[PDB]
Each structure stands twice: as structure tokens, then as C-alpha cells.
Amino acid sequence: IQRTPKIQVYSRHPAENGKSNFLNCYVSGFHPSDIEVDLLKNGERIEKVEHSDLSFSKDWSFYLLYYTEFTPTEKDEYACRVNHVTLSQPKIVKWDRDM
Amino acid sequence: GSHSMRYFYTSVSRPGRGEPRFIAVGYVDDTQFVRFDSDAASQRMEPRAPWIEQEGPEYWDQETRNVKAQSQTDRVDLGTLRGYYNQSEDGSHTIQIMYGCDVGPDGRFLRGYRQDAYDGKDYIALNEDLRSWTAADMAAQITKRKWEAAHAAEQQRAYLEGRCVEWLRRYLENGKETLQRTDPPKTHMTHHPISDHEATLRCWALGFYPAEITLTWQRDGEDQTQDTELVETRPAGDGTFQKWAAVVVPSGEEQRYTCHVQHEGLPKPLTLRW
Amino acid sequence: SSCSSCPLSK
């Protein structure tokens, strides 16, 4: 039995154009643990992205935080792309500054 | 108030690709403080919070002996449980283990835990009496008899009621500056018309620690829980947490709605209105 | 601190 990830994409602080911040992709509620999580800037994978150590909740589902330092602008679109066995294709979740 | 310490272990088989992946993490409350990764260079238990950094080699040596012994036990168990379930050698499977203790505000033991999973479902668990086991299925019954014969519960209880609580108290003291703080949420509201006649009101809580929080919406003082969109509480990445709650309202009626924020850090619950 | 005696084969 497999469980698909919940995905939230968000900033550490409310976004201000030109001010340094962190872009987060928080993946949770999933099983199995094998997962890929990429942050995209205008469709382009960001090279340098770190993540938390693998842990799990009381229902045994896994969770991870992927993050990278960034400066938002009006130009740039950001997204999180999640690749998991429960998904026949990777799911792309766009960043919304008010979610 | 109360505090917890937990260890979480994950072992994952990867057939024909070497030995299983093993990851250990330790937490106090909502703060991670140690890790072990079978695939990493160091082959030691490593620090992940600043207040554990001060432990000396006698600690790190014992913790490394411990996590190594757990990883070896789990690796063999992956074979055994493949056998109990008549599964092929080709598929990847996962053992997960959690254990830990809770203490009250006086530092005294409240509760201990030890529970194990196979492929994301309950396998075997130590009951709250710390004396007996609950087995999820026939495979786990085999484990249960084994563990009853080896007096496994007595060993776990000895740890849970002793070392676990003792070191939890030590950490709460040495990491006092971060573990014993309450950072109250910073709150605000956002508002977005959806059509000419509907709008979203969203109530934000940011920068709070610990993670436990409650956000509720009311309309004329009445709970709107079933019409509230919540997100799961999520990490900011700096050791604080975030959450929001939203409602859809008739445009012109925003003033009938109030957001209520309760958190340990707050002198008084907060009320927000647009 | 983690447990030194707890691991036992399943």
C-alpha cells in the first residue's frame, strides 16, 4: 500500500520583490520514502537545493522539506516538481505568494 | 508544559543495489537534534541542533554503537519479514521504528512508546503498560512470541523510564534557549475577491514555535469549522512554523467574520477581523 | 540518548 504526497510550496517570509528569502517545498503523507523533489525557476531546475533528513509521522507517512535561498521578482515563476511512484507523471505545483 | 523525545528509524531494502538504506533521526518536541545516514561518509551519529554539539566523544561513541546495532538488526529483519510474508527478493520494502518518552512540566515520566511498522502499516507495538505487545497480523505474532521469550519489553521499559527521561531533562536544560521558548505567531489577514459576489479571507499565523496551534473562523461568533479550508502546519525552515485558515464569504459581509488564534506563546487568544 | 539494549531480531 502506497500513499501519494501532499505538497505545499511557499516562502519562509511573505514575498517582497528584491528581498532575499527561502523557497520551500514541503512534501508529506507519502509512502514509500523514495521521492524526488525539484524546485523550478521559469521551468528550469534549480541546481542547489537542500532538504531535511527523512522522518515520519505517527501514521507512518514520510515528510521532507526541500528549500533554497532566492530573491523573488515580478518576472520569475517558481514551482515544485514532485516525482513519486504513486504519480504516473511528475506533479508540478506553482508557487502562489498568498498560499 | 510537557515535552517529548523520539527516535525515528527507517530501513529500506534495494534489492541487487547493496545493503538497505538506513536513516535515523532524533527529536525533542518539534526540534530535530541528531541524525545517522547509512549512505553518508562519516558513519557516526551526527549533530543537527546547536545544543547537542557540546556532547563529548563518550556520547557520540555510544550513540554510534546504538544506531549501528539498530541498522544491522533492521537489515536482517528485512530478510526475515520478507520470509514471513512470502514476498519475492525483487521488491523494495521498509521497516520503520519509533520510540521515545514524554515528561510533564515537573520533568517526571508520563508515557513511553515503542512501535514498529512494515511497509507503512502497523507491525508490532508496545502497549501503554510497557509490559505487553500488540501484533497487527500473523507475521507479527511470530515476532511477539520471540520478543515475549527474550523479555524484550523489560529492556525497552528500562530505557523508556530511565535513560530516555534523564536525557530528555538534560536536553531541555542545555537547549533551554531554543527548546523552552515560546515564539508566538505573527498574524495577518489577506483578502481576495473571487467573483463580484464572493471573496476569500485568509488568516495567517507565522513564525511560531511549538507547532501546536489552533486557527478557527467564526461568523457572528458562531464556529465555521466545516466551511474553513486549513493547510497542514508546515515548517518555515528556520525552526518556526506556519499555518493559515481560509473562508469564502459574501462580498460585503467580511465584517461578520472573525479569525481566532490560540497558541502557547500568546498571553490571550487573538481575534482578527477584515 | 538512544537505547543500547533495545534491538532484538523479529
Residue numbers in the entry:
A (entry chain B): 1 to 99
B (entry chain A): 1 to 274
C (entry chain C): 1 to 10
Publication excerpt:
The peptide binding groove of MHC-I molecule contains six binding pockets, A-F, which span and accommodate the binding peptide from the N-terminal to C-terminal. A minimum 8-mer peptide is required for structural stability of the peptide-human leukocyte antigen (pHLA) tri-complex that is contributed by two amino acid residues of the peptide that serve as “anchors”, one that fits in pockets A/B and the other in pocket F4–6.
Continuous and unambiguous electron density was observed for both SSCSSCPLSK (10-mer) and SSCPLSK (7-mer) in the antigen-binding cleft of HLA-A*11:01. The 10-mer peptide is anchored into the binding cleft predominantly by residues P2-Ser and P10-Lys making polar and non-polar interactions with HLA-A*11:01. The side chain of P2-Ser is hydrogen bonded to Glu63 and Asn66, whereas its main chain carbonyl makes hydrogen bond with Asn66. Apart from interacting with Tyr7 and Glu63 with its main chain amino group, P2-Ser also interacts with Tyr9, Asn66 and Arg163 via water-mediated interactions. Additionally, the main chain amino group of P10-Lys interacts with Asp77, and its carboxylate forms a number of direct hydrogen bonds to residues Tyr84, Thr143 and Lys146 of the antigen-binding cleft.
